[PDB]
Design a protein around this ligand. Structure first.
Ligand SMILES: O=C(O)[C@H]1/C(=C/CO)O[C@@H]2CC(=O)N21
Ligand SMILES: N[C@@H](CC(=O)O)C(=O)O
Ligand SMILES: [Cl-]
Length: 276
């Protein structure tokens, strides 16, 4: 009967997939809800740079600090051997960068040094955890910086979420219940104006569908397990309405192109349902 047939359709798709896949959908203006494998903790990876950006922009809003205020970034903070367009652009460090530019690198391009710079700015991972909890969203654990996750293999699992929590947080954000209008407009634009994950949530959608999103990805260990392949965001339906969706393909033995196709197929079948 509608939602449960779509849910059964997704579960049948997931049966032969060697991964633990979590799915959540929340209508923005017309309450719609769908969960698959909700009672599970999924490693977030890069998706938690969205949570960090909320915390940075909230701090700017509350303390009346301009997004153009510049922060001095020491060379020792532009770590090597990590994804970081910031360090590529400023290899020698010791540069004054506006918060706006660090945020853009972090959200739109998933900069890891940008991420840790901003964690320092808001007072560390626990401060972001508290900020998120006090918004009334439970079941998000934020324990490790990018530099910390790049050490032991296990550390990435201490940044975890249920799919429900993400989609609740995306909806609060998207309905502008969190930020000032200017902070909201900026974060939203950087989530639309990203080049990442073209084969994930957006993979099978019609050309030009606007999708504000944040990806997350992990390494693959030598037992062929890719810990995390994620995409979360807000999608615009043909009638101009929206839905928040989060897909976490975790602890997967499948090849990377299958992991992305899973996100794209699931999103497509949710799209088809709400369009019909
Ligand atoms: O497009 C719409 O009319 C509504 C809808 C209808 C089907 O549940 O559900 C999704 C949530 C939303 O905004 N959409
Ligand atoms: N997706 C449709 C569902 C329906 O018309 O029954 C609405 O909107
Ligand atoms: Cl690969």
């Amino acid at each position: 009967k509608g939602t449960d047939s779509l849910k059964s359709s997704i579960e049948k798709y997931l049966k032969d997939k060697k991964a633990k896949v979590g799915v959540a959908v929340l209508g923005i203006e017309d309450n719609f809800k769908l969960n698959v494998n909700e009672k599970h903790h999924y490693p977030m990876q890069g998706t938690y740079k969205f949570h960090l950006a909320l915390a940075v922009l909230d701090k700017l809003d509350k303390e009346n600090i301009s997004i153009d205020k510049k922060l001095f970034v020491k060379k020792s903070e532009l770590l090597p051997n990590t994804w970081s367009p910031l360090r590529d652009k400023y290899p020698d460090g010791n540069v004054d960068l506006s918060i706006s530019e660090i945020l853009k690198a972090t959200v739109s391009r998933s900069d890891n040094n940008g991420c840790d710079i901003l964690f320092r700015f808001v007072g560390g991972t626990n401060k972001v955890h508290n900020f998120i909890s006090k918004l009334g969203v439970k079941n998000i654990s934020i324990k490790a910086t990018e530099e910390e996750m790049h050490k032991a293999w296990n550390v990435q699992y201490t940044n975890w979420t249920t799919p429900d929590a993400t989609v609740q947080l995306l909806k609060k954000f998207y309905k502008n219940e969190i930020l000032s209008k200017n902070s909201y407009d900026y974060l939203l634009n950087t989530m639309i104006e990203t080049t990442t994950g073209p084969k994930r949530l957006k993979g099978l959608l019609p050309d030009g569908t606007v999708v504000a999103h944040k990806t997350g990805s992990s390494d693959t260990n030598d037992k062929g397990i890719t810990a995390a392949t994620n995409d979360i965001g807000i999608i615009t339906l043909p009638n101009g309405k929206h839905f928040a969706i989060a897909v976490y393909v975790s602890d997967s033995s499948e090849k990377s192109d299958v992991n992305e196709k899973i996100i794209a197929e699931i999103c497509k079948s949710v799209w088809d349902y709400l369009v019909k």
